[PDB]
Design a protein around this ligand. Structure first.
Ligand code: FAD
Ligand code: STE
Ligand code: STE
Length: 563
């Protein structure tokens, strides 16, 4: 009753990160009617705009609240996997860190037309950077806003860089400069606009919300993709939810459906639509249109553990939690003033924007990413500590001053999978991260060596001046076996998730889309989101998604070609 006798040249399944990019570029003429279905609500929450409010988005109504299956290798735990639920998707709920990884990450893709030389100009075209001048590696006319963090913890951040130098790291002045080595310590740039989150809704969708040929339905949960027998013809959805009407949106001649539901929901909606491994589809009675085995396989996510330690009493009050909460847990008006009046202060921080890439054992590229947080974790699950920090407000307690180092296997070898658990297209998918399952135990070894690394850093002269012992994992965790166990019981997502409908060369019986993002053996069906990533780059994945999305968009409108 919203697409009534209307036909669309492009239907966008999901209004997330890549979705926002595509709607902008494809609607930019006027001949193409574009439809954007988003299951979550509109992007208006003040928790979304303030970076420090990321603490409130986890396990909120703006999150899918996805929980993984039992992981037997993780002490029989279910792993919470944050995913954004609103216009702009995860770019509106994320830590705002801006990373491209290394050039070799894209060369390792092996896919024709998507080498590092091919992708570079698209990163740059999308970017306006407040702190690097225009060059081969940075842009100034682009829709993204990228800036150095506008919060510095004068004492703890400098101690961290002194400690990294003391144990033998060198600085990296730009982790996204492919002209030098990825490894090193420094400051991560952030996808922010003078301290306001610069998510893809704000940067791409919101400016073009006036075009008459662009229709953006929120509260619109898609259930399947109409594939008449093979050629897609539209989608089915519901504006109320599981207890609503089954609306249908038709496509114009030549109209294409583009999946933008993310690496969790795109392979899931594809399986409900008959695109998947037949054995899995038969088990729920779904007709097989395309029998591609890679739909849902190859899920890559970057697991994390942490160390945490308090400052000496002589340094009580210098952590970021002391810049946000007062001793009774209410937000300090000084922090509120600095944010609103100047875009400065603790409120501009997602907390984990300084760090390092380290090779734990002479790998071709760093296997370890370090995120230093000048606040003290109180749960070894770093996501849980963020949730706990939100609910700590006004509770009348003083959050203790300290530091945390989060350790991330950033180029992991373990792969996971996404599947069906019900025939209910509104049921949660069958989600298995598969952390620590690679046959060599390289991911466990990366994280275990990360713990040793962080302890050496904590023991340096520069940090030992500030620190007073260690809370996590603590004095009791001494042997490699104990470290390994501590990791199994605390490991959490650094929140990537890529690879579940991967792209590849013709004759890749393992891939799902071709180097032009069309799914094999279906007409008018393309995937443009984090699913198509064949091998996760080092670092956080939001920026490469935007790059894939800009490049797709230009390909569809004949501005560029691939191969
Ligand atoms: C908590 C968190 C922290 C992160 N931190 C960072 C970081 O610091 N830096 C960074 O670069 N990356 C980060 N990431 C990752 C980055 O945000 C994502 O990798 C990227 O945004 C993925 O883009 P996408 O378009 O593939 O998916 P999304 O942006 O998630 O888009 C998918 C969209 O599809 C919608 N959808 C799903 N199912 C349906 C349906 N049935 N009907 C309609 N709509 C549907 C969803 O609601 C969502 O809006 C973070 C991720 C999260 C979750
Ligand atoms: C922990 C994050 C705090 C965010 C608080 C938002 C404050 C806005 C005041 C207007
Ligand atoms: C932004 C406000 C800072 C709050 C500080 C809380 C104390 C520090 C806990 C650190 C835990 C490790 C970092 C986990 C980061 C999770 C965010 C993400 O992965 O998207």
């Amino acid at each position: 009753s919203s697409p009534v006798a209307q036909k669309y040249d492009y239907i966008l399944v999901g209004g997330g990160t890549a979705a926002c990019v595509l709607a902008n570029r494809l609607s930019a003429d006027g001949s193409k009617r574009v439809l954007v279905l988003e299951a979550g609500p509109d992007n208006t929450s003040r928790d979304v705009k303030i970076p420090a409010a990321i603490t409130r988005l986890f396990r909120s109504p703006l999150d899918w609240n996805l929980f993984s299956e039992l992981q037997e290798q993780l002490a029989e735990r279910q792993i919470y996997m944050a995913r954004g639920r609103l216009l702009g998707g995860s770019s509106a709920t994320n830590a705002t860190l801006y990373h491209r990884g290394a050039a070799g990450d894209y060369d390792a893709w092996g896919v024709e037309g998507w080498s590092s030389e091919d992708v570079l100009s698209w990163f740059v075209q999308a970017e306006t950077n407040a702190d690097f001048g225009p060059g081969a590696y940075h842009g100034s006319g682009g829709p993204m806003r990228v800036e150095n963090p506008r919060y510095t913890n004068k004492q703890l951040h400098t101690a961290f860089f002194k400690a990294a130098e003391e144990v033998g790291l060198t600085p990296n002045s730009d982790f996204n400069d492919w002209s030098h080595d990825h490894a090193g310590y420094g400051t991560f740039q952030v996808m922010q606009d003078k301290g306001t989150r610069a998510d893809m809704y704000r940067q791409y969708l919101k400016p073009v919300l006036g075009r008459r040929n662009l229709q953006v339905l929120t509260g619109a949960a898609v259930t399947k993709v109409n594939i008449d027998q093979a050629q897609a013809l539209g989608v089915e959805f519901s504006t109320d939810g599981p207890t609503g009407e089954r609306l249908s949106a038709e496509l114009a001649p030549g109209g294409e459906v583009i999946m933008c539901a993310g690496a969790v929901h795109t392979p899931f909606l594809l399986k409900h639509s008959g695109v998947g491994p037949s054995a899995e589809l038969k088990e729920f009675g779904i007709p097989v249109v395309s029998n591609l085995a890679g739909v849902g396989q190859n899920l890559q996510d970057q697991p994390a553990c942490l160390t945490a330690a308090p400052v000496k009493e002589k340094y009580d009050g210098i952590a970021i939690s002391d810049h946000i909460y007062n001793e009774k847990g209410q937000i300090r008006k000084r922090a509120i003033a600095s944010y609103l009046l100047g875009g400065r202060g603790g409120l501009t921080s997602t907390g984990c924007d300084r760090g390092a890439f380290v090779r734990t054992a002479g790998q071709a590229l760093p296997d370890l990413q370090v995120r230093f947080v000048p606040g003290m974790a109180l749960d070894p699950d770093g996501v849980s500590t963020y949730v706990r920090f939100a609910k700590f407000q006004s509770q009348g307690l003083k959050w203790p001053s300290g530091i945390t180092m989060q350790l991330i296997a950033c180029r992991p070898q373990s792969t996971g999978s996404v599947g069906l658990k019900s025939a209910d297209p509104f049921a949660p998918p069958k989600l298995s991260p598969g952390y620590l399952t690679d046959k060599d135990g390289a991911d466990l070894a990366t994280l275990r060596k990360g713990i040793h690394w962080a302890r050496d850093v904590a023991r340096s002269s520069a940090l030992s001046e500030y620190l007073d012992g260690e809370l996590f994992p603590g004095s009791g965790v001494v042997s490699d076996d104990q470290i390994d166990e501590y990791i199994r019981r605390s490991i959490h997502s650094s929140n990537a998730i890529t690879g579940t409908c991967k792209m590849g060369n013709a004759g890749d019986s393992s891939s799902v889309v071709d180097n032009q993002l069309r799914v094999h053996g279906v007409e008018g069906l393309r995937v443009v989101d984090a699913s198509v990533v064949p091998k996760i780059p080092g670092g956080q994945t939001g920026a490469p998604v935007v790059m894939i999305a800009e490049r797709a968009a230009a390909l569809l409108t004949g501005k560029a070609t691939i191969g």
